[PDB]
Amino acid sequence: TVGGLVHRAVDGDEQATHDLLAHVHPLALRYCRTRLSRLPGDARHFVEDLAQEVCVAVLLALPRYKDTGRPFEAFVFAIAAHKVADLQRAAMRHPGSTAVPSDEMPERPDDSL
Amino acid sequence: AAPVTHIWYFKGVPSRLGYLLDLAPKDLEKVIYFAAYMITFVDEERRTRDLPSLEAHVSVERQQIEQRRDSDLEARAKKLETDLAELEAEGAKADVRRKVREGAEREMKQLRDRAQREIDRLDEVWNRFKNLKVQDLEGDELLYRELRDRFGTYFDGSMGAAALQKRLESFDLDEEAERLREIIRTGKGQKK
Amino acid sequence: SDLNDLYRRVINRNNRLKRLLDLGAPEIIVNNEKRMLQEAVDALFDNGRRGRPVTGPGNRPLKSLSDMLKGKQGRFRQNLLGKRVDYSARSVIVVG
DNA sequence: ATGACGCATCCTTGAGGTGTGGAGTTCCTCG
DNA sequence: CGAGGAACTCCACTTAGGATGCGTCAT
């Protein structure tokens, strides 16, 4: 099952981690699809960029993944929510960055007389 | 770091779809948008040179496979006669013999089906190896693994935008220009 | 400007993939990131040509480098043939 | 306190929107 | 290579901004 797969992935096997991340991939995309699709900010299609990034986090957690029998799904949800919060503090803090095209070219005066 | 393809030329208007290599847009969007591998390189001259040795090794290893399956077959036979003898000695019910024979026959047909399957994928290895040609697509991946392990250190095949770069690093123009001109005046209709 | 955002995101994906491959991660995630980089550049050069165009704050699509040129409101038929000029008044007409 | 760091909480799933019209064409699947 | 024929690509184109994960590193 997945438990043994992650066990031999942390053992050091390349194919084990390969299959583990392959299985994590689509579930990460789908969870971020359901979570980030409604968040304030232009992130509806950035859910991919933090989905497989959770796998990057998995990569920085696997070598010291002292598993206690807990499923990896709660883990994945945890890092997904945490990276969602990271986006929240990156955007909503001084959220002056607005991609407005309709009120930028006519509304900007020119210093050169 | 990851190579990328321009969108106007490849995948863009059909009129200027590339066609440096005679491929369909469908083929391009499988190879570049990550569906299937391609064969970027082939060494057919060394393959033909070693064909004595390649076929000798194929014969040796197919004989090894066949004798392994014969060992499995005699293992099946001893299992079948053992269970026959013990269930005939038991005689608990009138349907233990027929049910054990049904199970044994299911096992037998499964064994021979997978033997047929492995010789069949070896036949696919055969035809793909003799038709080892560039600008060809391989939908499956485990078959590609088997092909590259068995025919190791002979050719190159993969994904990647730069994988097409290497193709354009090797493909000439004048020879096939003459060939398509020949088919332009020696040909029929839309081939021209 | 939207092109600013497109360049920002493609640079983000480039950095993420380069740092991932700096260590040699398993190939599935690497390939997914490579194809996402390809798709990001595809959207950059022409957001609407392939797939669902990438939007921004609202549901409206962003504008790529091949949309600020073509069309009526691009450069050719909007800014080079006719250039609004000084010493150019206007007012109401009355017969005399 | 922010925008940064360093992780990292046992049950698991979108969201709507998408109402012309014109001929060009070129591949692509079926005679 | 010779069929239908349905995608793909061109052209006509007019206001204020839904957060966290919690803890804390550092200024």
From Swiss-Prot, chain B:
Domain of life where this protein originates: Bacteria
Subunit structure, as described in the record: The RNAP catalytic core consists of 2 alpha, 1 beta, 1 beta' and 1 omega subunit. When a sigma factor is associated with the core the holoenzyme is formed, which can initiate transcription.
Family: Belongs to the RNA polymerase beta' chain family.
Described function: DNA-dependent RNA polymerase catalyzes the transcription of DNA into RNA using the four ribonucleoside triphosphates as substrates.
Protein's name in the database: DNA-directed RNA polymerase subunit beta'
Organism of origin: Streptomyces coelicolor (strain ATCC BAA-471 / A3(2) / M145)
Gene that encodes the chain: rpoC
